[PDB]
Amino acid sequence: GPEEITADIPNVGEAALSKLDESGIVYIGAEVTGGDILVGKVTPKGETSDVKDSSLRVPNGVSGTVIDVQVFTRDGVEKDKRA
Amino acid sequence: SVTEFLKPRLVDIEQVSSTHAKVTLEPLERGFGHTLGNALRRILLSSMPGCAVTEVEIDGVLHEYSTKEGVQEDILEILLNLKGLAVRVQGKDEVILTLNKSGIGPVTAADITHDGDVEIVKPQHVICHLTDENASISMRIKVQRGRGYVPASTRIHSEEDERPIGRLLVDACYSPVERIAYNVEAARVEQRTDLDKLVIEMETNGTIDPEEAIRRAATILAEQLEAFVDLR
Amino acid sequence: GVLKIVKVYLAVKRRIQPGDKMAGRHGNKGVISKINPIEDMPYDENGTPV
Amino acid sequence: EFDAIKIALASPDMIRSWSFGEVKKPETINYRTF
């Protein structure tokens, strides 16, 4: 199945999702340290919840301030609030 | 000889400018002038308390690496300009000033809202420039009293409620002095020839008086030497 | 095969510190060995440190 | 535990002795279930 970029991620606390917006993308200007979650993504699990966490995270030891977010959407896919 | 040491006294203070100043210590015994001058210069250049800008908050700005519509200077340039602001605080030890400006023109330190305790030494210090009639700037500036150079990276260590998006951290250089020089010359007291007079020239930001700075440096030196007085 | 792409840009202000490599225009290069306090720098008659 | 290493070419019988089974298909992963 497809991979959805949503703000709802399993096995994560509310503190980690505080920086994420309603669309699942980190706010512009937020200061993120190593290990922080930037873009929330869920991948369908095996046939055998049924979703695994494949969200993008800041690499360990990398800090900084989010200054720009660019979203590229293929035609035929509904655009989110950030786009 | 044993008790013949002449105690130096603050003779004359010359204020040639708002920032530049000159102080004189006289009389001084042979050799003591260089020691006192070096100690005072080293203490003053490092451990002089002063007030500096710590945090800034602009309404329309989310982070330093951004721009505001209607201002010529970048947000980073605005923070750098605010870093050099000279402000004296009497008792609060922590002040939050507000700046509001509109219309085309140079926004300087004179546009900061009046507070009774605080005082701006340089009202003509330019902060930014508004290049649009409809452009308006509103800013909150946090001023804190401290000592030495404290970069914002060390201040990041504090973790109470994090920081809201839009609060910009500014490196603080609390030292009010920027240049200290000293020179020993011949002094004339009665009929004694082997006496010295010390002249100390201080260039600061204008937020501290030369006499107060000299008194503070002497107090710090005496407190440090009190450990050697009682060696135990 | 790919539906969406999201790119996030992070800005870091790197300050100078010991170990950083500096150089000149005449082939002279080196690394900062110590960030000495201002009062420890040599100064001229006017008191301006180097 | 061991003192020396012996190297020689392998007979088909010894090769069969090594194997725990016979591979008969080129399929690797179902790609639906892993």
Curated annotation (Swiss-Prot), chain A:
Coiled coil regions, renumbered to chain: none
| Biotech exploitation of the protein | Co-administration of salinamide and rifampicin or salinamide and myxopyronin suppresses the emergence of resistance to both antibiotics.
What post-translational modification information does the record give? Acetylated on several lysine residues in the presence of glucose.
Superkingdom field: Bacteria
Q: Which protein family is named in the record?
A: Belongs to the RNA polymerase beta chain family.
Q: Partners and quaternary state?
A: The RNAP catalytic core consists of 2 alpha, 1 beta, 1 beta' and 1 omega subunit. When a sigma factor is associated with the core the holoenzyme is formed, which can initiate transcription. The rRNA transcription and antitermination complex (rrnTAC) consists of RNAP, NusA, NusB, NusE (rpsJ), NusG, SubB, ribosomal protein S4, DNA and precursor rRNA; S4 is more flexible than other subunits. In pull-down experiments interacts with CedA. (Microbial infection) Interacts (via flap domain) with Escherichia phage lambda antitermination protein Q; this interaction renders bacterial RNAP resistant to transcription pausing and allows it to read through termination signals.
Function comment: DNA-dependent RNA polymerase (RNAP) catalyzes the transcription of DNA into RNA using the four ribonucleoside triphosphates as substrates.
Protein name per UniProt? DNA-directed RNA polymerase subunit beta
The protein's organism comes out as: Escherichia coli (strain K12)
Residues included from the entire protein? 846 to 945 of 1342
UniProtKB/Swiss-Prot annotation, chain B:
**One GO-annotated biological process of the protein:** bacterial-type flagellum-dependent cell motility
Q: Which GO terms describe its cellular component?
A: cytoplasm; cytosol; cytosolic DNA-directed RNA polymerase complex; membrane; transcription elongation factor complex
User: How does it get modified post-translation?
Assistant: (Microbial infection) ADP-ribosylated on both alpha subunits by the phage T4 protein ModA. ADP-ribosylated on only one of the alpha subunits by the phage T4 protein Alt.
User: Where is region (Alpha N-terminal domain (alpha-NTD)) located?
Assistant: 1-232
Superkingdom to which the source organism belongs? Bacteria
* Keywords linked to the UniProt accession: Acetylation, ADP-ribosylation, DNA-directed RNA polymerase, Nucleotidyltransferase, Transcription, Transferase
* Recorded GO MF terms: DNA binding; DNA-directed RNA polymerase activity; protein dimerization activity
| Disulfide pairings | none
The EC code for this enzyme is: 2.7.7.6
Reaction(s) catalysed by this chain, per the record, are:
RNA(n) + a ribonucleoside 5'-triphosphate = RNA(n+1) + diphosphate
- Annotated signal sequence is none
Q: What class of enzyme is it?
A: transferase
What's the reported outcome of changing residue 42 to C?
In rpoA112; temperature-sensitive, blocks RNA polymerase assembly
Q: Where is this region: Required for interaction with Crp at class II promoters?
A: 159-162
Give the family, as the similarity comment puts it. Answer: Belongs to the RNA polymerase alpha chain family.
Describe the function of this protein.
Answer: DNA-dependent RNA polymerase (RNAP) catalyzes the transcription of DNA into RNA using the four ribonucleoside triphosphates as substrates. This subunit plays an important role in subunit assembly since its dimerization is the first step in the sequential assembly of subunits to form the holoenzyme. Part of the processive rRNA transcription and antitermination complex (rrnTAC). The complex forms an RNA-chaperone ring around the RNA exit tunnel of RNAP. It supports rapid transcription and antitermination of rRNA operons, cotranscriptional rRNA folding, and annealing of distal rRNA regions to allow correct ribosome biogenesis.
Q: What is the protein name given in its UniProt record?
A: DNA-directed RNA polymerase subunit alpha
The species is Escherichia coli (strain K12)
UniProtKB/Swiss-Prot annotation, chain D:
Q: Which residues of the full protein are shown?
A: 16 to 49 of 1407
* Protein role: DNA-dependent RNA polymerase (RNAP) catalyzes the transcription of DNA into RNA using the four ribonucleoside triphosphates as substrates. Resistance to the antibiotics salinamide A, salinamide B, rifampicin, streptolydigin, CBR703, myxopyronin, and lipiarmycin can result from mutations in this protein.
Can you state the subunit structure given in the record? The RNAP catalytic core consists of 2 alpha, 1 beta, 1 beta' and 1 omega subunit. When a sigma factor is associated with the core the holoenzyme is formed, which can initiate transcription. The rRNA transcription and antitermination complex (rrnTAC) consists of RNAP, NusA, NusB, NusE (rpsJ), NusG, SubB, ribosomal protein S4, DNA and precursor rRNA; S4 is more flexible than other subunits.
Q: What is this protein called?
A: DNA-directed RNA polymerase subunit beta'
Biotechnology comment: Co-administration of salinamide and rifampicin or salinamide and myxopyronin suppresses the emergence of resistance to both antibiotics.
Q: Taxonomically, which superkingdom?
A: Bacteria
Entry comment on modification after translation: Acetylated on several lysine residues in the presence of glucose.
Classification from the root reads:
Bacteria, Pseudomonadati, Pseudomonadota, Gammaproteobacteria, Enterobacterales
Indicate the family of this protein.
Belongs to the RNA polymerase beta' chain family.
